[model samples]
Target: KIPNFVVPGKCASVDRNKLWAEQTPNRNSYAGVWYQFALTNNPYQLIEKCVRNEYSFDGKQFVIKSTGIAYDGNLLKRNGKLYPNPFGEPHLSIDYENSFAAPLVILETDYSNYACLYSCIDYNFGYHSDFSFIFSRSANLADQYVKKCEAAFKNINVDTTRFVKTVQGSSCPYDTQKTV
Candidate 1:
């Protein structure tokens, strides 16, 4: 419901390792297997990625296969942003879900345990909307990191109450354990 905002806060940015921020990296900074801990723009008790070899991301690029509430095939997009899934349309037979992309800006991260990502985009006539994601190295968010993520959100005026903690447990499986 906010106006004149595309990326949300003034501090929200595609942040990364300082030295690499300019020259960047041989690999994309936001690359890795991550478990969504919370979000604001969409649903999924959480969002997920790369479990086993079924999917993969190598920093600069990725590939994936998934089963989700958003349909077993198409991932939350139909004709365009905020559109419904074309369930009647045939699903792709192979490597395609992750190939269809959206803005994935890294708002802030510890480069390890937690990462908060944000993205705001303008569509036709300049209607602006945004999304935010809180991710963890593991399904459970450690108390310390939870506070850190909340603080980061507050630091940028992103009301934590507006965010929903992603549901994670035995029902949701993951295959990675790499977070700072």
Candidate 2:
């Protein structure tokens, strides 16, 4: 069943239906591992080293397995408080199993080079959290790609200043492991 996490509040200026462009990605093209390059500030402060997503399609739904370290540089439990338990949507929605439902939109990508991930959730009392992340097939991306991501953020009205580069290198704290 689909879960709802919306809180009562005045409707924000942004419309979810109008958020995504006409271009949609093919399911098969989204399979494989994607390394996080940059992301917005999160409440749980999940911005640590080796942040990566491994996706696999079973012909019915997309299963996502994300791995990352906590801000203190420690491995997170499967049901850890900060674990992002991202569930996929046909168009790109990252639903945290026990937390808020995040609608992710793939602004642009070639399935091999780079992908831009966007999400925004409104809360009660006119509060909200918006995020934009740039992913690559490799650990690092070129500056040109990063500039394009910044442009995409501007187009979506998200503050680029909140963007933080994720650490990814051999010296990362966690072992390169996969959890599903």
Candidate 3:
């Protein structure tokens, strides 16, 4: 197990097993995709963890997997699956009108401390390029968050200009509001 470098105070001594159990669940559990930060000095570090957890994209619905949770429930797809998806290539290409679809392109990255994960909705139904979406860990992140990411990217000399600022959307409603 890796050393607990970020924990503070008495909790610092907790073992991994106990630590995990005691840790509170994030309100946004499994709602969005996640990628670990690697090459802390690179701009492309954001797309490092590109897993293809099946999703449905109908223009507004953006669910990451079968949980039925959605980035925008309005765009929910009737069926979807999840798997390893890398960034950089065209995202899953599929006919938007069809019952099922997947992207052809893939994301590549080196795993590290910072992780980046996003979701995509196939705008088309055929094996063709179409509209897609990229999401991060949090919605409405503070400027400090962006600056930290930018600093990490700059360390690697990766151009920040190529980066796109995605519109912040709501997290899975169930995960955010569920009482349990």
Candidate 4:
């Protein structure tokens, strides 16, 4: 264990024992477009509107494709042009990636309806930052599902107040040309 000595009242802690993962996520059932229904306060503030993740699993590994709009135009601007913010590509081997980024967990997933992703990364100040995302198969989630997600967040000791409900509708931002 690392000793914490930065500033008074500042503490470094993590519940490593509480980390969890699905026994086995049905590859076929889990593979699909999942829209973000809610998310914890992001330090980078990368999510704004139309945030979604598409997943595909080959027999070998899981592939992820994330698409979203930037909260600030300048965030994704290049040469005075804005682009769709994209992340995760070329398929990721969960087992392989986990070697480097350990404990990246899928706390729960119905594979057909909802999923909860959780991860913790070590950073400076002797602290580890936690992140969790609640996703649904459809752009719009049912009220009961939202509550289920909230309960999951609470179970993980995450501040529910920090979660912002994402808005998804026909008018949501989308540019086909910007997709990657």
Candidate 5:
């Protein structure tokens, strides 16, 4: 069955620097809590891969990756230590505790509620994949929040016009037991 839209959630925690140093012997490390989500209504099985690298912001350098989807920053590939547990279903963990003090929550909606149209039989499978975003929390956001997020993406060369308004979903699954 197809889902109407996808939802996202995340958590982050703090840990000691020494633990990170020991775990990631070749690089500097920090520990923290982290997680994210991609709620979807499409039956098209999604594929996710991890990635990592440094990006320059105003000549300064920083690194960011999906919390667990692929390359988690907090996890250290060491000789004798066990893998980190504060990981998501398909992503890796980053040392979050000693870094930023607060865990963040973000939500995103499909572009143009395309699911309604894309799920149609005439839809093509080769179209561009949609985009998802990271956020601070889940409380109801003001219209400006959405507009600001869209503008930021546009500034980064993303086409904001394709973005659709995201709708809230219930914790339970859609009903289907009764015969049509």
Candidate 6:
């Protein structure tokens, strides 16, 4: 497992289709700007962690615009031995239509509030890039709530290392290098 980049706990094992039905009964429920922060096992900077992204679905495809930090390709509901329910787990995959292919698993979310997401990309080599995110309703979500989001991962036994708090808001001084 030296380069597997695995995510442990309930977050890695829960039934995703059921998760979709409960967390996001409405497709547009998760469509909005969110305070985004994340943790990753990416050794290179290619996988950005601290960035802001906007999400919207036209009921046909998800429009993910890099509001400032990052971007993603077309999204599709995966169909395979692991993912079966289409609408229930519509976000089981990301970057599927391009070279940035990866599996973005929706771990947890409360629709109008917070969401915990995790993803992994197995490059051609033996190594893999893993990422986990905490998305909030606002830029200044309370510390307690952020802690709760972290707990969601911890409870599932997922490793919480390399978690970088994402920056947001108009207070950004410049386009200089961001420190971890």
Top-lDDT structure, candidate number: 2
TM-score per model over all chains: 0.55, 0.73, 0.28, 0.65, 0.26, 0.64
TM-score of 1: 0.55
Tens-place lDDT digits, model 2, residues 99-130: 65556667666677788877666665575566
Pick by lDDT: 3 or 6, better one:
6
Tell me the number of clashing residue pairs for each predicted model: 3, 0, 34, 0, 25, 1
Residue-by-residue lDDT tens digits, candidate 6, 1-180:
445354232224546566656644455787765556555555432324334445666764465544333323222121111122354544455552234445666677776777787765454545445677787777656777667777877765566765776656565321322221
Deviation of model 2 at 30, angstroms: 1.2
Strongest candidate by TM-score: 2
Return the candidate ranking by TM-score, descending: 2, 4, 6, 1, 3, 5
| Model 2 C-alpha lDDT versus the unseen true structure | 0.63
Model 5 per-residue lDDT tens digits across residues 70-112: 1232222111111222433222132222232111111222222
Score each candidate by Cα lDDT.
0.48, 0.63, 0.30, 0.55, 0.26, 0.54
- List residue ranges in candidate 2 displaced over 4 A: 1-25, 45-47, 77-91, 173-175
RMSD of each: 9.9, 6.8, 16.3, 8.6, 17.7, 7.7
Q: TM-score for model 2?
A: 0.73
Find the 10 residues in a row with the least total lDDT in model 2.
77-86
- Clashing residue pairs for model 6: 9-156
Mind sharing the TM-score for model 3?
0.28
Extract clashing residue pairs from model 2.
none
Decoy 5 TM-score against native: 0.26
